[PDB]
Design a binder for this molecule. Structure first.
Ligand code: F5A
Ligand code: GW9
Ligand code: GW9
Ligand code: GW9
Length: 269
């Protein structure tokens, strides 16, 4: 079309603008074809404490430091998502009609959707062996994550499984931008007031996405349906994650939950 392609572009531009780590900037680091200075590999406890030597500032004033090895990892890992939530909250502005929604419906969308988008985008920085960290400056291996003591070794491995099959779709930021937009405009979230209004808004994004996918990836005929399954998959992935988070709350007495994330997880699933 033309007006649609403008909207699809308006979304993409908001994607690159807000999220500092896109799939292009990431796949080039993992390829190592643009530089000979690879990110610092974190594969065991020694390499971890080395890299942590860089953040000794944020670690001392936060009281972690002497905390357990796993707690330290996923303590800063929370600060990441808190940032991605903010970037996502701003990315939602560009969505046509979103800013107009009732302030309650806006928060509800961003409540049940953020983590579904975080894990989706989180695939862009993963591979079969690990993921990028610190805006591409670090690469934490996948086996080291599976080596932590339970239940921390069950946190990231599920996401790696999704990112491997999801990456297999060969998507570019051009598409993910729209894909993440549709995730936020899901009219299925509990507590939505104007269900009719939101569904109209989502159908616009999905319609744009369905044509964009057929245009940018014409050979993968059922690519659009596959992604719909992925949305369903992510919805399930975030649910299990929420259960595993609350499981860490009812047992681990030395792992505190970030204030912002508390409100998100509160009575989520
Ligand atoms: C992906 C990530 C960081 O996943 C978590 C993994 C571990 C924790 C915790 O260590 C923790 C701390 C306090 C409580 Cl009450 C429960 C769990 C939190 C989130 C997220 O969700 O952004
Ligand atoms: C998260 C957990 C642990 C560390 N660390 O001790 O090396 C770092 C991070 C992290 O995400 N650091 C970061 C984020 C963004 C930009 C630069 C560095
Ligand atoms: C945790 C959640 C999300 C990201 N991310 O996609 O930027 C990274 C991490 C993480 O584990 N960061 C990290 C960096 C350095 C040392 C430990 C942990
Ligand atoms: C955010 C970024 C980096 C670190 N760190 O490596 O010390 C910590 C945090 C952070 O906000 N931790 C936290 C968890 C729970 C409640 C408040 C703060």
């Amino acid at each position: 079309t033309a007006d649609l392609k403008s909207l699809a572009k308006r979304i993409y531009e908001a994607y690159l603008k807000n999220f500092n780590m896109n799939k292009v900037k990431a796949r080039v680091i993992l390829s190592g074809k643009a530089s000979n200075n690879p990110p610092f590999v974190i594969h065991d406890m020694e390499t971890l404490c080395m890299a942590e030597k860089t953040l000794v500032a944020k670690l001392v004033a936060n009281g972690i430091q002497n905390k357990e090895a796993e707690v330290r990892i996923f303590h800063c890992c929370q600060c990441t998502s808190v940032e991605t939530v903010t970037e996502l909250t701003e990315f939602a502005k560009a969505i046509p009609g979103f800013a107009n929604l009732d302030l309650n419906d806006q928060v509800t969308l961003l409540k049940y959707g953020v983590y579904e988008a975080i894990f989706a985008m989180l695939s862009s920085v993963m591979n079969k062996d690990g993921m990028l960290v610190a805006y591409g400056n670090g690469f934490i291996t996948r086996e080291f994550l599976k080596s932590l003591r339970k239940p921390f070794c069950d946190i990231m491995e599920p996401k790696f499984d999704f990112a491997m099959k999801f990456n297999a779709l060969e998507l570019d930021d051009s598409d993910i931008s729209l894909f993440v937009a549709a995730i936020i405009c899901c009219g299925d979230r509990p507590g939505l007031l104007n269900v009719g209004h939101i569904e109209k808004m989502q159908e616009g994004i999905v319609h744009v996405l369905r044509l964009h996918l057929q245009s940018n990836h014409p050979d993968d005929i059922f690519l659009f349906p596959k992604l719909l399954q992925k949305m369903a998959d992510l919805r399930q992935l975030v649910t299990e994650h929420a259960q595993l988070v609350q499981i860490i709350k009812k047992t681990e007495s030395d792992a505190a939950l970030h204030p912002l994330l508390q409100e998100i997880y509160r009575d989520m699933y």
